[PDB]
Design a binder for this molecule. Structure first.
Ligand SMILES: CC(=O)N[C@@H]1[C@@H](O)[C@H](O[C@@H]2O[C@H](CO)[C@@H](O[C@@H]3O[C@H](CO)[C@@H](O[C@@H]4O[C@H](CO)[C@@H](O[C@@H]5O[C@H](CO)[C@@H](O)[C@H](O)[C@H]5NC(C)=O)[C@H](O)[C@H]4NC(C)=O)[C@H](O)[C@H]3NC(C)=O)[C@H](O)[C@H]2NC(C)=O)[C@@H](CO)O[C@H]1O
Length: 485
């Protein structure tokens, strides 16, 4: 909001009022972190001061003027900042105009839409055709190979989830061989939500968990001792530290609390590290659902962090780099070593020409990671992507579907993001969509591979827009402002 304070002779004074009007919590409005403010004037700037005292840093670039709120750029609930601008009249456009608030968040960040519900779809009593565009491609068992890394830029199928359960010839954690394995259906639905919400490749999370703590992989290796697991009447070993508080993704307590502060819209105030990550042999453990999602958020944080600093050069880097897996290598490296490690690489600045021309990015920059973390994850991901013969599937009962959303309701979002009525209304849509899609299989169940993405999209139609909230808060403001990769 802006207002003319004083107009007299050759001097114009405008009061720009910025605020977070929200008194209570609202979606993506619990806090606002402002990078900078830009307005336009042909007149010369005399003084820019706060109304309550002091003054912000401002920069003039011709008609464009960039105001820096510095330590006042953070806007929590019920917080107003008024800026008084004094201009000496000059040119044909003296009045300050075209005010643009720039949030501390990469505006050029992209999240690939995996698929969409048919345009005819409506909340209430939709038909089967309102769920399925064409029955041919929807139930098409044929598999198309892909080469996606961390982000699914080009999904193999619009409505299907393709988890490549391929054999791994690569020595995973000093093992002879390895076999990709989904522990249970609830963890799979976890990956699916992480895939539809934050556009994260399920194969990448599978590969990550395998390297971190054998969470998603079994082996024939006699040397490795673990739990007895049988696939196709063959004995396999599952060497997972199931008691590890950091879970199968090895998400540290410090990283958990950090992204918790970054994303209040995602995490409730009661979000505890152990309850969210620590899984067990019991498939009914809620952490089977939460841990792949928490990992997806923590991974997303890094991508959001780079975008906030690098800005537009991120997209330029993706299209000009000679390494196809480049982004995946960076993100995976920052997951294991930390975001500071990526920053210290100075890839997007000092070593721009070296990384952008690197055929293999992790080899030149020595981004091996602990125990060859980065090369392991990439190769397994590539293998799972290349797998077309053996794709994961499961039978999801209604009790499975309802349990999943129950856990989501309890472990994610804040009170007020989704009303009780809006949720019950969403469930009726999910219930109907389940019933309609179950007919193809006999009414006993739906396919995780073929139907569950549709189930999510139906549910997410009632989820607050935009679905992906902004990283915000005090901690995010300092880190993202000073981040220089
Ligand atoms: C040779 C071989 O193959 N051996 C295998 C072996 O790989 C297997 O053991 C398991 O290996 C993995 C590593 O590959 C072990 O895991 C962890 O993994 C964690 C997640 O990647 C990682 O946590 C990250 O560490 C960063 C550095 O501290 C953190 O960044 C920092 O966070 C702070 C607070 O947020 C912040 O203040 C700092 O600024 C920030 N630092 C920087 C530079 O920015 C980061 O937050 C954190 N990430 C997350 C998501 O939590 C651990 O560092 C890493 N530890 C080690 C020693 O590598 C895993 O623990 C191993 N498993 C077990 C049971 O120990 C093994 C399979 O079990 O088989 C062998 O054969």
């Amino acid at each position: 909001a802006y207002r003319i304070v004083s107009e007299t002779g050759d001097k114009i004074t405008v009061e720009l009022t910025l605020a977070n009007k929200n008194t209570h919590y609202v979606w993506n409005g619990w806090c606002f972190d402002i990078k900078n403010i830009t307005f336009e004037t042909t007149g010369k700037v005399l003084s820019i001061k706060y109304a309550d005292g002091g003054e912000p840093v401002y920069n003039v670039n011709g008609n464009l003027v960039t105001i820096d709120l510095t330590w006042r750029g953070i806007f929590h609930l019920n917080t107003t900042v008024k800026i008084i601008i004094e201009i000496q009249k000059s040119g044909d456009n003296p009045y300050p105009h075209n005010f643009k608030i720039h949030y501390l968040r990469g505006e050029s960040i992209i999240y690939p839409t995996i698929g969409e519900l048919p345009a005819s779809w409506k909340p209430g009593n939709f038909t089967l055709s309102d769920l399925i565009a064409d029955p041919k491609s929807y139930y098409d068992p044929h598999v198309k190979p892909h080469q996606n890394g961390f982000i699914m830029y080009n999904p193999p199928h619009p409505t299907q989830i393709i988890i490549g359960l391929a054999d791994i010839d690569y020595p995973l954690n000093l093992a002879s061989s390895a076999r990709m394995w989904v522990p249970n259906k609830y963890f799979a639905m976890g990956l699916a939500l992480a895939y539809e919400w934050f556009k994260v490749n399920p194969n990448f999370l599978m590969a990550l968990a395998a390297k971190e703590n054998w969470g998603t992989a079994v082996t024939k290796d006699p040397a490795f001792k673990g739990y007895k697991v049988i696939i196709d009447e063959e004995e396999y070993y599952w060497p997972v530290q199931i008691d590890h508080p950091d879970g199968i993704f090895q998400v540290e307590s410090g990283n958990f609390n950090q992204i918790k502060a970054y994303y209040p819209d995602i995490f409730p105030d009661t979000a505890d590290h152990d309850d969210y990550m620590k899984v067990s042999l019991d498939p009914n453990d809620t952490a089977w659902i939460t841990s792949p999602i928490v990992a997806a958020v923590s991974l997303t944080m890094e991508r959001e962090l780079l975008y906030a600093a690098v800005g537009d050069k991120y997209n330029e880097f993706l299209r000009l780099a000679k390494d196809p897996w480049a982004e995946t290598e960076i993100i995976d490296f920052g997951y294991n070593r930390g975001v500071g490690a990526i920053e210290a690489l100075k890839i997007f600045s000092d070593n721009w020409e070296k990384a952008i021309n690197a055929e293999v990015l992790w080899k030149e920059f020595n981004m091996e990671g602990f125990g060859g973390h980065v090369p392991t994850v990439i190769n397994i991901t590539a293998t799972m992507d290349m797998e077309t013969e053996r794709i994961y599937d499961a039978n999801l009962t209604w009790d499975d579907i309802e349990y999943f959303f129950t856990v989501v309701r309890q472990k994610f979002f804040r009170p007020g993001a989704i009303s009780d009525e809006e949720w019950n209304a969403m469930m009726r849509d999910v219930k109907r969509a389940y019933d309609l899609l179950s007919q193809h299989w006999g009414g006993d169940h739906i396919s995780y591979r073929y139907d569950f993405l549709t189930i999510l999209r139906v549910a997410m139609k009632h989820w607050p827009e935009p679905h992906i909230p902004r990283p915000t808060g005090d901690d995010w403001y300092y880190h993202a402002r000073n981040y220089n990769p």
